Amino acid sequence: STPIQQLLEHFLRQLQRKDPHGFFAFPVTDAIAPGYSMIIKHPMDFGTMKDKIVANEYKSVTEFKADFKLMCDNAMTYNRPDTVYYKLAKKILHAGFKMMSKERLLALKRSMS
Numbered sequence: 001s002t003p004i005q006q007l008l009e010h011f012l013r014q015l016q017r018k019d020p021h022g023f024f025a026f027p028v029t030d031a032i033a034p035g036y037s038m039i040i041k042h043p044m045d046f047g048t049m050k051d052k053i054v055a056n057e058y059k060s061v062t063e064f065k066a067d068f069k070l071m072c073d074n075a076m077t078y079n080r081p082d083t084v085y086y087k088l089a090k091k092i093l094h095a096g097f098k099m100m101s102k103e104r105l106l107a108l109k110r111s112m113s
């Protein structure tokens with residue numbers, strides 16, 4: 001494991017703790033969400049993000065945050081605002097962006113000195 005992989009695994013574990021039912025753990029299938037593949041063209045989930053960390057496919061925290069944002073945005077696009085998925089996606093998105101904020105990453109960058 002490399003330092004970037006350990007950092008991304010830490011952020012991913014913290015985000016995944018906010019989804020105890022595993023709604024974001026693996027891809028959404030059309031069987032459990034009719035028309036999903038017809039509405040969501042760039043699917044994303046925590047399991048795919050984990051595979052990308054293990055394969056060393058993320059060059060930066062910005063790329064990781066972009067996948068996290070895509071996952072939440074997909075749930076808010078497919079699902080209406082009064083649904084469990086939309087509400088959890090909104091809660092998870094705000095918490096993840098606070099955790100990986102520019103202030104937190106600037107403090108972490110300054111600690112690399």
Ligand SMILES: COc1cc(-c2cc(C)c(=O)n(C)c2C)cc(OC)c1C[NH+](C)C
Nearest residue numbers: 021022023024025026027028032033075085
């Ligand atoms: C009902 O259960 C699930 C629901 C969703 C889900 C997740 C999201 C983000 C979504 O937008 N939709 C529309 C759906 C249907 C995913 C699931 O598994 C990945 C499961 C099955 N789990 C064992 C709990």
